[PDB]
């Protein structure tokens, strides 16, 4: 009974050059699930990131 989910898929920059068989070479989504604060680190750039 959760709320309806909608998303727009982009298939741009896809080539069909007959490279043998069919296989997915790229997959990504921006809809991250909720997460818990694991830890944080400091990189040389001076920023702070919580993972």
């Amino acid at each position: 009974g959760a709320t309806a989910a909608t998303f727009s898929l982009s298939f741009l920059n896809s080539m069909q050059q007959n490279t043998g068989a069919n296989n997915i070479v790229a997959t990504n989504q921006n809809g991250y699930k909720p997460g818990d604060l694991v830890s944080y680190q400091i990189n040389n750039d001076g920023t702070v990131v919580g993972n």
Partner: protein, 51 residues
């Protein structure tokens, strides 16, 4: 090779070299040095012209 797929040493320095340009790809010695990267993309199909 890091996640950006670049020729990098253990400290974070980007190796530089002459970029390979042209069709077919070739290395020109008169170009400005550029970072050397190894893309995951596949080369496009070639139309036969000389046999």
């Amino acid at each position: 090779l890091d996640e950006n797929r670049n020729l990098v040493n253990m400290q974070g320095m980007q190796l530089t070299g002459y970029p390979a340009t042209g069709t077919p790809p070739t290395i020109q010695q008169g170009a400005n040095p550029a970072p050397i990267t190894i893309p995951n993309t596949l080369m496009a199909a070639k139309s036969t012209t000389t046999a």
